[PDB]
A paper describes a structure:
While this mutation abrogates catalysis under catalytic concentrations of the enzyme, catalysis was still observed during incubation at stoichiometric concentrations of the IgA1P-E1605A/IgA1 complex. A cryo-EM 3D reconstruction of the complex resulted in a 3.5 Å resolution map (Resolution shells are shown in Fig. 2a and structural data parameters and refinement statistics in Supplementary Fig. 2 and Supplementary Table 1), which facilitated fits of the individual domains with subsequent refinement. Although there is no visible density from residues 233–240, which connects the remaining hinge within the IgA1 HC, it is clear that IgA1 residues P227 and T228 are properly aligned for cleavage within the IgA1P cleavage site consistent with previous biochemical studies. Potentially the most striking finding of the S. pneumoniae IgA1P/IgA1 complex is the conformational change associated with substrate binding, which underlies an active-site gating mechanism.
The active site is formed between the MD and CTD domains that bifurcate the Zn-coordinating residues of the HEMTH motif (residues 1604–1608 in the MD) and a downstream E (E1628 in the CTD). We have determined the structure of a member of the M26 metalloprotease IgA1P subfamily of bacterial IgA1Ps both in isolation as well as in complex with its human IgA1 substrate and solved its structure with a neutralizing mAb that provides insight into blocking S. pneumoniae IgA1P activity.
Numbering used by the authors:
A (entry chain P): 1435 to 1963
B (entry chain B): 241 to 450
C (entry chain A): 242 to 450
Amino acid sequence: YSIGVYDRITSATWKYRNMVLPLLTLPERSVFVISTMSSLGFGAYDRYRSSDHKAGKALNDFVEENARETAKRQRDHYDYWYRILDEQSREKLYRTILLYDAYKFGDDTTSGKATAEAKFDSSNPAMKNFFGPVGNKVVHNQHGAYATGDGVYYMSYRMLDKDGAITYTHAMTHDSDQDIYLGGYGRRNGLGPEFFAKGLLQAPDQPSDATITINSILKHSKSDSTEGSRLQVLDPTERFQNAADLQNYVHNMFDLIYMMEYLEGQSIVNKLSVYQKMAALRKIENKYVKDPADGNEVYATNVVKELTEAEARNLNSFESLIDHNILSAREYQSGDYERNGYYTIKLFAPIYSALSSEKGTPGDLMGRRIAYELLAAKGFKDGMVPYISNQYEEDAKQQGQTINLYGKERGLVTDELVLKKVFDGKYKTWAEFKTAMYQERVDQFGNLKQVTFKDPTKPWPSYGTKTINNVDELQALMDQAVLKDAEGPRWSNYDPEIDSAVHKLKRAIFKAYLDQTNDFRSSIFENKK
Amino acid sequence: CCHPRLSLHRPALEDLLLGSEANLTCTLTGLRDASGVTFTWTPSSGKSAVQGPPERDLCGCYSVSSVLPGCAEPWNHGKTFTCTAAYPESKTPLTATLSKSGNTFRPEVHLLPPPSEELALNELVTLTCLARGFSPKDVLVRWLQGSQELPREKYLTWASRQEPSQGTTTFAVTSILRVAAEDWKKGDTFSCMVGHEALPLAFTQKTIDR
Amino acid sequence: CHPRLSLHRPALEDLLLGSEANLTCTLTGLRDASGVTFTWTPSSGKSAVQGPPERDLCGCYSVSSVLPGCAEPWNHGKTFTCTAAYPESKTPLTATLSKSGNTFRPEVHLLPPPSEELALNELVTLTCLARGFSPKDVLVRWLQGSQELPREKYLTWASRQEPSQGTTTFAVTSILRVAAEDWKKGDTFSCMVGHEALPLAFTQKTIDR
């Protein structure tokens, strides 16, 4: 329980306990120790010395303040994760795992973060007096960060920079997702370690990122220019006080997302030609491939393909979009996806698809989407943990559905079992669940909607407001924007991104609604809407 | 540079009735190949469409466009355009509204003697006669005051911008003309007009100066 | 791909009326990795925020930024040779907004001509053609009381060339047909021309008759 360093390194079952004697003898302040709840980071001052920061008062000032800020950010992150978990597994968020820095020290002549890996004979005081005495030969490749399971190592992302915490949350999720973030049960048999991290359970890479994430670390006030295109949570420790607050936040966010997606879908089937509908949409399916780890081929990988013309003409019904498993091509590539890949779902790119594997594992692109939707229906306990944490594995084995894992008979948690257990009487097929969510959202925004929506959707000369008051004007704007993308659809650059007008309108509406209230609390304007 | 797509095409009916060469090539972009691509027209009066002459635009090689660049009897009907010289890779549909004569307008020349405080000599007079007469941008709009064609430098098909007027509004192209003092005393004023796409010429000549 | 320079020509009149000065410099010619790095070699301490890049429809993505934040230099404008680092080439590329004073006096042309020829019984026309160019921006601006309308929505014709031999002159024609009732209603009746050097925005008459 102690946050004190000596009570951590001194304590038994520590990977590098001997790190106390070099630390007590360090001649000068050449190493920093960020000892927060559940982490014991060790860094060198020479890691941040460059041309901009010179050895002396400047380096000591840049490191001390940035280390204090990083400690505060990690403390806020674990405060959030402690407030969320309420299944008495929070008492296990006291493990200690070191966060060694790169060992790539930089002289005052180096322009940026130098890439000279030290060889353990380096004259740099940190290597000679501490990091070298506590030997820990690390692979030290030039770029990337990896979590060995018992620790975390930063090779490129500096631990003190603001981009250090966005990698810190990813590495921690890989390091402790088997008995910490989940209810206590291990990862799902099909999902890999990269599934529970980049797409879900990670802070967003950038504030203006249009991705479905939870800003649990970075606390950025409205003073910064980042307020433009915030598209995320203002304060993590303020917004999230318990699991109910997270469920409500995700519920409101997905309410707005479902409203926008239903508007775009109504724009698709009504005002769009056939040839334009071909390129505007794609079809997602699940392909089963043999994996080297396990002999069984029950695992499914998501594959995105161009839908045929025969399927395009049959997409007239909005319900059909969900049934024919079609997804928008604005942000999702046309190539086949892979398992355990750095794939995240975009915030404004609709996925009307409810594709579910009747086999054990959904995939990656479809897995994260449904999991976030389940978080809207039910909170992190129940909801998301059954979908991604195989806690219903034993039930599967008792009913049937066995799988040969490493030569032993084990339970195979299928999506059908997850659906029949989480929502036993409410739904029977994932398509029904998606349709019921859309219908609830429709009955919602048909009556109660805030008229205070301020979306410019225009060029550099400042445009003050559009003041949409009822969903009909917003649907008309969405129709006009979709028509515009179909016209002149060069798609020249590999990523159109912000250029497409449809994305501009969605981002504007999202930012307007986020700035209207303090945060995502409720998206329903209780009048004759 | 970055896509698979085109740009807006300027339908070519200007060459068909206002020029000796009846070219029928509406401007198209993103086509970098030989002119063997099929041409599709909603309504065809008689003769098959003829693709326009190769030119390089936006670092794009030999770009195809769509001709019947001289079917004058069929052109008189005014049936739409919506040029679609689609490439095999590109979507087949083409669409620029240009069917039966729409929003036709008459020329409104505005030429009057102008005071020249800065030009006491009177050798050169800067007069910008008022224009109109063409609702359709893709037309061989030319000015021919008198029975003799005016200055090669001053004679061309200048582009025009639609101007904010009561009721119907028609684009006008400025026609400033520089002539010698003897020509001014000649009384050979130059008429200024704009011609609609549906009409073969659609040019009206009426001007009075000094 | 290949770098290109386009004269943005930011309205001078809008900048004077506007609380915040409006100025922009952009370079076109980027065909490389999605990540883009842009920096300005010369900084006068004025705001230089960069807006999202806008495609030219031939691919070749090109970045942009603002040069706002200048209110003290009403007539003493800064240099216009932007140089921002890009992913395709580390060396900066010169951007020119062609900043030249070109000081000159502007006189417009108003004529009551052929009443029968220009009247449809209820048709009225006003003649104010812009003459005299000093800066790189010219507008056919018209004064319409205190009414405010979006600049982007309005569409107007560009500059014209009206230069006497041995002299440099520019033309803009501050003309857009509107009701002539205001002229006889006692309301302000002066066409507005935007010139930083001499933006009188009213008819000028020579002493000679």
